[PDB]
RNA sequence: UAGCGCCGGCCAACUCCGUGCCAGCAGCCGCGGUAAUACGGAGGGCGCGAGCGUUACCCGGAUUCACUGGGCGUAAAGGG
RNA sequence: UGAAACUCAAAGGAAUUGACGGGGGCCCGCACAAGCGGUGGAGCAUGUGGUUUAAUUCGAAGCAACGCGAAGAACCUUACCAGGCCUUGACAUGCUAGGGAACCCGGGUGAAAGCCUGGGGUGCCCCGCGAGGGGAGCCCUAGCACAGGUGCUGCAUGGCCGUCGUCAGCUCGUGCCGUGAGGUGUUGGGUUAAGUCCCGCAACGAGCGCAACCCCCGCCGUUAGUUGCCAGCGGUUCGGCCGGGCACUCUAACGGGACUGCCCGCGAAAGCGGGAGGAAGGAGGGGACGACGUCUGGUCAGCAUGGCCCUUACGGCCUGGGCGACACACGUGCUACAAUGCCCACUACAAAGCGAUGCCACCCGGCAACGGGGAGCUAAUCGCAAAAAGGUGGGCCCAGUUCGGAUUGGGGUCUGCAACCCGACCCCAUGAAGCCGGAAUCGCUAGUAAUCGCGGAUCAGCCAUGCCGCGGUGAAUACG
């Protein structure tokens, strides 16, 4: 076993960096640290919204945060109160006048992080794991998605012994570079430990 | 099995991207999914703690859904409407009611004089003609009077027994009630009017006169009064009562209360 | 990586040669990198995530 | 005057406490060590009802002595 | 010839899928064989087992633990030990009583932590009449929800990793065969690095795997010519140094090229043996890439995490010690045992990297480690930087030796608050074991083995002879 991260494998080709900025050796670490802080804050805050991705950019002491969300309605709210206070909070974190942007993902069934998050939520709601995985895979496959696969880690239904569940459908060629495989991991914290939900979505070629 | 029946129910309820709807007893949310897909902001009154996770998971990808942990009977729905549907034009009600609390629910909803556009519900055929009938229909009664007074109602859909996953015991009929702007007949003494209606149908075999005289505490006292009133109003008590209507009942009620109330 | 030890290495330890470096993500003191400020494990994790700009798998 | 048996599959009738290979149940298959629809008790249900169960014996199911209506190369059964 | 009493709920027949066999057949891989160097012998470095100790913190245990976690233990690291000390606490969000708000500062104590203290107070926000003034702004000081735990289980788990193994396998859909479990495909012949292809055949396809898609090297085009380059010309202090060009090398972007594509023979085909052409010829060399699964595999000490436990101590500061012990025993390495060599002068030829709390040109002082002055460089410019083996010339002449450099004595430099336990380096003496290593055993099929240097991470400095990379010279053998 011991497969490698399908994103880190395809960073150069068919995938793009989540962070897009340049810095010399002098200031690389500080920028990365504040970047991590921003990512952590936004992960904590915008959970319910259906976050999928956080993008960070820098031009000249400027930050352009972009957040991919299934339901931007949750993010904005009434008269953009929430987004405004969120911008205020982010700017208070780092004195660089961040320019927050919000994008809606088309067909949130085609986002591996979202699928993993949903299945993790279902697990935390004490759903049957096998049925949940089957339904998730079918749901993804109905929305185009030339291939899908979902894995749940272990410690199923409070059983003493842990076991992997696994379910795939279609083509998931993890070995080919021009595969455009979307990957998503979610951790489900349950009364009887932790479960790891992985999702691969094979969405076209090249 | 419920695959297309729900779509037909929603179609008959005639919801659009601007109409608001009220859901009672959502369970999983079979109707709720279709309602969210077709209609504007929805609302639910689930009370079952066990099915709450399943409903939450079902309605996770929807943003126009509100869930309330209140019983319909106990909760004053006026505030519910004034709070939730603050922009909507027409507020309808769609639900599948659980047998027992089906008549109480309808009665409570109607007796509170909501600004609801109407109601579309799925209940059993048994009590379906009992709330949409005519003179001499063998299903005429107090329930029919109440429903056909408060609103305008007619049975729409007949879902047969052989549709559900676990085979039930009774055929079902989806009924649509278009709410009425003003009550069909004007009664000053509405309460005793209702008691009169229930008195004329305490026993459906006896004649109307005997029904009326034998069902009032003052029935013994005002035997002559009852007889004269029924005689003058051109609708005598010699009939059964199932052959009367809203109009005759209104006239008789006026006769009783203008003179003895 | 006791919380005390992490919170202690963040001050001036009365001398220059008493101070050391820790992973900014996990507080590991063993195998950190000056360029990143991350231990080897956090470096690998974040590099796989694609959250390190211009950092890619090498094959020469 | 309403009782009697049963509610794991045969076979119509399901939950909560008590017990923890103990006390026990059992026509067969079997159930009892911590979440027991299989033991004990309650609620409820099912069948029969001045009755309902148990034991004993006979025929059936048993084409399992095969006249109706079985078989004998390797399952028992071709004689040296 | 031939019972019964008593016991069990089975006893059996054929066939299917596996597991296994001191059954068989075929095939593969530095597995063996043919070679070339080693290890096991000596000294030292390092990691362990034991032993010792107040402590010698722990985890890793055939392959797949043992120059492993650790890409840097003198303090810090540090989790261990001996002492001195704190208990809403190093650290977070709160609650409730007034001192009362912030900050600056000075003595006792002293090994430091901590404690006791004495001073300028750093106050406004409202500016109610403005003189107390109730306020948010900070701050202590008690009462309390809470911190905290490298404390235990990897046999409750996640994530990540090792291993069989880059081995060639693991399955599914429809069809067909069978009463049925199931079979077929996926077996047979050939071929391949390969379930890679061809043929045969009730199978025809597909998915995860193999391959290819990606990167580096090998050849050539364009686009581009500075900090890189210099063929022709003009300068020239002889320096690509100047003016020039950018042709060539090169640097870094985009493409081309190699596919049994083309001829000859052979085979039914896959393919095989030769031949041009070509930089490369049949996978061109290397990397990234690790199937369903196996190992109660490894890690609660990277992190997260369910359960259990401690919460005036199993938490937290500080000084010193320890992880560096030593009758012994294993593993991985470094230097050698010499003349194909050792020492000393001169002269050459690289690549890939690194640097502003740094790289440090040059000059001067010292025999030196270094010190003082001092330019130039955020980098194709400046520097680290001497490349070493090599090639020349001189010496040694078979000797435990101009071999080997352990150990010890005596000076000295640098880092650092501090160099005793316990750093590195320079110099003068000292000059050990070692004359090629028993049984056994390891690596390697080509720019490989062997040998020679160079750079980097961690890092004040370094116990690095380690790890990751980079080039120089360059063997032998493979019948089976
Ligand atoms: Zn880390």
Task: Give CB contacts under 8 A, 24+ apart, made by A30-34.
Answer: A31/A58, A32/C36, A32/C37, A32/C52, A33/C24, A33/C37, A34/A93, A34/A94
Element (H, E) at A75: helix A72-76
CA–CA gap between residue B72 and residue B102 (Å, rounded): 11
Q: How far is the CA of B94 from the centre of ligand 1 (A)?
A: 55
The helix or strand, by DSSP H or E, that contains position B175, with its residue range, turns out to be strand B172-179
The separation, in Å, between residue A180 CA and nucleotide E220 C1' comes to: 34
**Residues 36-75 (A) with a CB less than 8 A from some CB of C:** 36, 39
Edge-first strand order for the sheet with A167-170 is A167-170, A147-152, A193-202, A181-190
Chain C residue numbers touching A35 (CB-CB < 8 A): 51
Chain A from 75 to 114: CB within 8 A of any B CB: 108
Local structure of A62: helix, strand or coil: coil
Q: Could you tell me the resolution of this structure in angstroms? A: 3.3
Determined by cryo-EM
- CA dist., res. B60 & res. A50, Å (int): 10
Query: Do chains C and B touch, with touching meaning 3 or more CB–CB pairs less than 8 Å apart?
Result: no
Q: Which residues fall within 8 angstroms of residue A72, CB to CB, at 6 or more apart?
A: A49, A102, A103, A104
CA-CA distance, B225 to B211, in Å (whole number)?
A: 14
> Mapping DSSP to helix (H, G, I), strand (E, B) and coil, where does residue B146 land?
helix
Tokens for A113, please give them: 């992080």
Question: What order do you get walking across the sheet with B91-96 strand by strand?
Answer: B65-67, B42-44, B20-24, B91-96, B118-124, B172-179, B151-159
**Is C10 at the interface with chain A, CB within 8 A?**
no
B48 CB-near residues (< 8 Å, 6+ apart): B27
Say whether B60 and A74 touch across the interface (CB within 8 A): no
Domain extent, residue C2, equals 1-60
* Nearest CB to A33; choose among C24, C50, C55: C24
Q: Are B100 and B153 spatial neighbours (Cβ–Cβ below 8 Å)?
A: no
Query: Sheet containing A66-69: which strands, arranged edge to edge?
Result: A19-20, A51-57, A66-69, A101-104
A neighbours by CB contacts (3+ pairs under 8 Å): B, C
CA distance B136 to B248: 14
Cβ contacts (< 8 Å) between A19 and chain C: which residues? 50-53
- Put simply, whether C58 touches A (Cβ < 8 Å) is no
Distance from the Cα of B11 to chain A's closest Cα (Å) equals 25
Contacts with A, C 14-43, CB within 8 Å? 24-25, 34-37
| CB contact at 8 A, A91 and A166 | no
Contact C22, C6 (CB under 8 A): yes
* CB contact (8 A) between residue A20 and residue C57: no
Tokens found for residue A190: 């349950």
Domain count, chain C: 1
* Strand E contact nucleotides, protein CB < 7 Å: 69-72, 74-79, 90-91, 113, 148-150, 156-164, 166, 207-216, 286-294, 296, 302-307, 315-319, 355-356, 378, 416-418, 457-460, 469-470
Nearest to A73 by CA among A42, A102, A110: A102
Candidates A87, A121, A112, A119; CA nearest to A101 is: A87
Sign of CA dihedral B102, B103, B108, B111: positive
A60 to chain C, minimum CA–CA distance in Å?
Answer: 16
Paired tokens of B25: 């007893």
Contact at CB, B56 and A125, closer than 8 angstroms: yes
Q: How far is CA A119 from the centre of its chain?
A: 13
Both tokens assigned to A13: 């080709």
């Amino acid at each position: 076993g011991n497969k490698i991260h399908p994103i880190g494998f395809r960073l150069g080709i068919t995938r793009d960096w989540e962070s897009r900025w340049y810095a010399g050796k002098k200031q690389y670490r500080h920028l990365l640290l504040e970047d991590q802080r921003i990512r952590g804050l936004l992960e904590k805050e915008l959970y319910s919204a259906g976050l999928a991705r956080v993008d960070i950019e820098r031009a000249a002491d400027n930050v352009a945060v972009t957040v991919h969300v299934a339901k931007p309605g949750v993010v904005i709210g009434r008269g953009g109160e929430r987004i405004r206070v969120l911008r205020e909070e982010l700017a208070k974190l780092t004195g660089k006048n961040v320019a927050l942007n919000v994008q809606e993902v088309q067909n949130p069934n085609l986002s591996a992080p979202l699928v993993a998050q949903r299945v993790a939520e279902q697990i935390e709601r004490r759903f049957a794991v096998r049925r949940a995985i089957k339904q998730a895979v079918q749901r993804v496959m109905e929305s185009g998605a030339k291939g899908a696969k979902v894995i749940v880690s272990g410690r199923i239904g409070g059983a003493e012994q842990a076991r992997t569940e696994w379910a795939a459908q279609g083509r998931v060629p993890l070995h080919t570079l021009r595969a455009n495989i979307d990957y998503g991991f979610a951790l489900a914290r349950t009364t009887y430990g932790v479960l790891g939900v992985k999702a691969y979505i094979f969405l076209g070629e090249v | 099995i419920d695959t297309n029946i729900l779509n037909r129910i929603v179609d008959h309820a005639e919801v659009t991207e601007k109409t608001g709807v009220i859901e009672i007893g959502p369970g999983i949310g079979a109707l709720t999914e279709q309602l969210a897909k077709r209609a504007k902001k929805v609302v639910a009154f689930e009370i079952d703690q066990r099915l709450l996770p399943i409903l939450k998971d079902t309605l996770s990808p929807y943003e126009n859904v509100t869930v309330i942990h209140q019983d319909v009977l106990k909760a004053d729905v006026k505030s519910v409407i004034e709070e939730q549907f603050q922009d909507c034009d027409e507020i309808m009600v769609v639900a599948n009611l659980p047998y027992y609390v089906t008549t109480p629910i309808i009665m409570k909803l109607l007796e509170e004089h909501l600004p609801l556009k109407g109601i579309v519900v799925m209940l059993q055929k048994e009590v379906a003609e009992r709330m949409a009938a005519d003179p001499s229909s063998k299903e005429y009664g107090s329930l029919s009077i109440a429903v056909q007074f408060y609103t305008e109602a007619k049975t729409v859909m007949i879902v047969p027994k052989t549709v559900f996953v676990p085979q039930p015991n009774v055929d079902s009929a989806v009924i649509r009630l278009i709410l009425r702007d003003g009550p069909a007949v004007d009664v000053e003494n509405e309460s005793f009017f209702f008691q009169l209606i229930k008195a004329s149908f305490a026993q459906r075999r006896k004649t109307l006169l005997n029904n009326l005289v034998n069902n009032l505490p003052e029935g013994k006292a005002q035997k002559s009064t009852i007889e004269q009133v029924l005689e003058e109003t051109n609708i005598d008590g010699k009939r059964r009562g199932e052959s009367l209507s809203i109009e005759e009942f209104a006239a008789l009620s006026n006769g009783l209360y203008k003179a003895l109330f | 990586a006791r919380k005390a030890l992490i919170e202690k290495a963040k001050r001036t330890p009365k001398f220059k040669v008493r101070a050391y470096t820790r992973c900014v993500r996990c507080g590991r003191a063993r195998s950190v990198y000056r360029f990143f400020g991350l231990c080897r494990i956090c470096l690998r994790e974040l590099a796989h995530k694609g959250q390190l700009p211009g950092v890619r798998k090498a094959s020469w």
